[PDB]
Amino acid sequence: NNPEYSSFFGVMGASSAMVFSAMGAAYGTAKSGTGIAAMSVMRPELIMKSIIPVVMAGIIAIYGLVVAVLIANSLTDGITLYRSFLQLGAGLSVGLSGLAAGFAIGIVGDAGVRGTAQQPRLFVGMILILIFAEVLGLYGLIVALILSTK
Amino acid sequence: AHSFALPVIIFTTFWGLIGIAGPWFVPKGPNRGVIITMLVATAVCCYLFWLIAILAQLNPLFGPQLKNETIWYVRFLW
């Protein structure tokens, strides 16, 4: 009674949630590392502070891990399709959301690292702007979670 | 088996007295204003947090969906 291929959409959800999130976090990490390497030469005392954008990106990667695992542990053979599309939506929703988050993380962090070194008063603002992007990424996680019971 | 009325009385009195009478029973040092703020703010936030948790579970529309092994176990556990 189960439409064939019904399990195909579900499996893709778990994969996408992880892959797109890794892409975002990796982008943010790559951007931050570039700014950190350039900044840290003149002000090595800021090396520890400069990691924050990267930790935030790492959170995005976790966001994705949570959905990918939640879906994976929710896969079966006799999937009724309805459930499968919910899982695919959850994967795609958090994936793109984390991807965009990671980009905002990376771009802002790069500028933030340089700005803070030149003007330490900008440190709090740097965290704030990255914080909003992390909150946006969380939404991506939550909606993926909501679908799991619909 | 439990009623809701008793839990509410016990914990409402606890946090209520702390937030209302508490300020009367406080050291007179330079931190008195902070301790009074603590007593009142704590009682209000803590009470409301708990009250929702216990109130929200009254008149439930459904029970838990349990795995087979647990369902059997409970027969001889609770």
Binding site: S93, L96, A104, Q119, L122, I129, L136, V143, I146, L147 | -
Partner: protein, 203 residues
């Protein structure tokens, strides 16, 4: 322009092939072999619904996220000489999250309508389910894209606001009016998405 050349070549070949196949089906007088109704009916409404839901949430955050770093970089750069900027110009980012929130609320309210059908043969089955499916798809798309472009607008405008305020603190308040319009544009998309799903039923 290696990537732009790739994108163009794919775009042109993609549509050029569609033109040849479409016209050929006509030329060889095929019995409407390419049947749009067939595609729409065999394609499960569940995909359309869940796609629109994912779009509503996913596109909206992309917009916000786009604008955030647009204004973030401008603020961080300018703020080196005008640290006052962070005091007021953060509201540009609040508008960006607010655009995401518009879509987020709709994404949840729409998904709350998702139900199973227990349906099989589309023949005389789910007549209403197809309407609701397509409507949910549209409403999700409607708000998603609308918030996407709003978030870009707000970012561009907020960038100018930060650059302006760095040089003249009196300009901040007046400029705020532009971002408000940007937010209103996104709300317009919300109004339509609400109407589109105002009378739907699933299952």
């Amino acid at each position: 322009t290696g990537l732009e050349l790739l994108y163009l070549g794919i775009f042109v070949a993609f549509w050029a092939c569609m033109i040849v196949v479409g016209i050929c089906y006509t030329i060889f007088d095929l019995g409407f072999r390419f049947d749009v109704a067939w595609f729409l009916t065999e394609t499960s409404p569940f995909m359309w619904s869940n796609l629109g839901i994912g779009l509503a949430i996913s596109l909206s955050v992309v917009g916000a996220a786009w604008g955030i770093y647009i204004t973030g970089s401008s603020i961080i750069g300018g703020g080196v000489k005008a640290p006052r900027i962070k005091t007021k110009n953060l509201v540009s980012i609040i508008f960006c999250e607010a655009v995401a929130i518009y879509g987020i609320i709709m994404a949840i309210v729409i998904s709350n309508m998702a139900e199973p059908f227990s349906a099989t043969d589309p023949k005389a089955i789910g007549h209403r389910n197809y309407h609701a499916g397509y409507s949910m798809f549209g409403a999700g798309l409607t708000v998603g894209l609308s918030n996407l472009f709003c978030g870009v607008c707000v970012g561009i405008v907020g960038s100018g606001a930060a650059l302006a305020d760095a040089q003249n603190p009196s300009l901040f308040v007046k400029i705020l009016i532009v971002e408000i319009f940007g937010s209103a544009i996104g709300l317009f998309g919300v109004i339509v998405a609400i109407l589109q799903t105002s009378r739907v039923k699933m299952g």
